[PDB]
Design a protein around this nucleic acid. Sequence first.
DNA 1: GGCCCTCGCTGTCAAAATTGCGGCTGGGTGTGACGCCCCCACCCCCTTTTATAGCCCCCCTTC
Length: 48
Amino acid sequence: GFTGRKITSQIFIGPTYYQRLKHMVDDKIHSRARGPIQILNRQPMEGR
DNA sequence: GGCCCTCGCTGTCAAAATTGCGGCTGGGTGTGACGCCCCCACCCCCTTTTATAGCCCCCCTTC
Protein backbone atom coordinates (compact mmCIF):
# COMPACT_ATOMS: atom_id res chain seq x y z
CA GLY A 1 0.00 0.00 0.00
CA PHE A 2 2.90 2.39 0.52
CA THR A 3 5.27 1.91 -2.42
CA GLY A 4 2.92 0.14 -4.83
CA ARG A 5 5.32 -2.77 -5.31
CA LYS A 6 4.09 -6.34 -5.46
CA ILE A 7 4.58 -8.29 -2.26
CA THR A 8 6.90 -11.18 -3.11
CA SER A 9 4.91 -13.67 -1.07
CA GLN A 10 1.26 -14.29 -1.89
CA ILE A 11 -1.02 -13.34 0.99
CA PHE A 12 -3.80 -15.68 2.10
CA ILE A 13 -6.88 -13.42 2.22
CA GLY A 14 -10.61 -14.07 2.52
CA PRO A 15 -13.80 -13.35 4.48
CA THR A 16 -13.58 -14.46 8.11
CA TYR A 17 -16.14 -13.86 10.85
CA TYR A 18 -14.71 -11.63 13.57
CA GLN A 19 -16.30 -10.49 16.82
CA ARG A 20 -15.65 -7.40 18.91
CA LEU A 21 -15.38 -8.17 22.60
CA LYS A 22 -16.64 -5.99 25.45
CA HIS A 23 -13.02 -5.69 26.74
CA MET A 24 -12.37 -2.17 25.53
CA VAL A 25 -9.40 0.08 26.19
CA ASP A 26 -11.53 3.06 27.26
CA ASP A 27 -13.13 0.93 30.01
CA LYS A 28 -9.66 -0.20 31.22
CA ILE A 29 -7.38 2.89 31.03
CA HIS A 30 -6.67 4.24 34.50
CA SER A 31 -4.23 6.73 36.02
CA ARG A 32 -3.83 8.39 39.39
CA ALA A 33 -1.53 11.18 40.54
CA ARG A 34 -3.01 11.76 43.99
CA GLY A 35 -6.52 10.96 45.11
CA PRO A 36 -8.79 9.83 47.91
CA ILE A 37 -7.41 7.58 50.63
CA GLN A 38 -9.03 4.88 52.75
CA ILE A 39 -10.61 5.55 56.13
CA LEU A 40 -8.61 2.81 57.87
CA ASN A 41 -5.28 2.49 56.04
CA ARG A 42 -4.77 6.05 54.71
CA GLN A 43 -3.64 4.35 51.49
CA PRO A 44 -4.97 4.83 47.94
CA MET A 45 -8.32 3.22 47.20
CA GLU A 46 -9.04 0.09 45.17
CA GLY A 47 -9.75 0.38 41.43
CA ARG A 48 -10.61 2.94 38.73
C1' DG B 1 32.39 -60.87 101.60
C1' DG B 2 31.23 -63.16 96.88
C1' DC B 3 28.05 -65.86 93.11
C1' DC B 4 23.42 -66.35 91.18
C1' DC B 5 18.49 -65.95 90.51
C1' DT B 6 13.55 -63.32 90.50
C1' DC B 7 11.39 -59.24 91.13
C1' DG B 8 9.41 -53.70 91.28
C1' DC B 9 10.24 -49.28 90.02
C1' DT B 10 11.48 -45.25 87.20
C1' DG B 11 12.23 -44.87 82.80
C1' DT B 12 12.49 -45.05 77.41
C1' DC B 13 11.39 -45.62 72.53
C1' DA B 14 7.83 -46.33 69.75
C1' DA B 15 3.38 -46.34 67.92
C1' DA B 16 -0.88 -43.89 67.51
C1' DA B 17 -3.85 -40.25 67.67
C1' DT B 18 -4.72 -35.05 67.88
C1' DT B 19 -4.21 -30.44 66.14
C1' DG B 20 -2.48 -25.21 64.21
C1' DC B 21 -1.43 -23.92 59.70
C1' DG B 22 -0.70 -23.03 54.68
C1' DG B 23 -3.07 -23.03 49.86
C1' DC B 24 -0.27 -17.37 42.67
C1' DT B 25 -0.03 -11.98 40.97
C1' DG B 26 -3.13 -8.32 39.93
C1' DG B 27 -7.32 -6.18 37.41
C1' DG B 28 -12.53 -5.07 35.94
C1' DT B 29 -17.99 -5.51 36.49
C1' DG B 30 -22.27 -6.02 39.28
C1' DT B 31 -25.83 -6.93 43.47
C1' DG B 32 -27.86 -6.70 47.95
C1' DA B 33 -28.88 -6.49 52.86
C1' DC B 34 -35.22 -13.60 70.65
C1' DG B 35 -38.65 -15.22 73.80
C1' DC B 36 -41.03 -16.96 78.59
C1' DC B 37 -43.57 -15.83 82.60
C1' DC B 38 -44.37 -13.00 86.19
C1' DC B 39 -45.25 -8.50 89.06
C1' DC B 40 -46.45 -3.50 89.33
C1' DA B 41 -48.58 1.22 87.86
C1' DC B 42 -51.86 3.52 85.08
C1' DC B 43 -55.81 4.04 82.14
C1' DC B 44 -60.49 2.63 80.09
C1' DC B 45 -64.80 0.85 80.52
C1' DC B 46 -68.50 -0.78 83.27
C1' DT B 47 -73.22 2.53 84.31
C1' DT B 48 -76.82 6.70 83.95
C1' DT B 49 -78.83 10.82 80.30
C1' DT B 50 -79.74 13.69 76.07
C1' DA B 51 -79.93 16.10 72.02
C1' DT B 52 -78.54 14.68 67.06
C1' DA B 53 -78.41 11.26 62.24
C1' DG B 54 -76.45 7.56 59.06
C1' DC B 55 -75.73 3.06 59.43
C1' DC B 56 -76.86 -1.63 60.33
C1' DC B 57 -78.94 -5.92 62.99
C1' DC B 58 -83.04 -8.31 63.67
C1' DC B 59 -87.60 -9.69 62.89
C1' DC B 60 -91.55 -9.42 60.07
C1' DT B 61 -93.94 -9.57 55.80
C1' DT B 62 -94.59 -10.14 50.87
C1' DC B 63 -94.97 -13.40 46.94
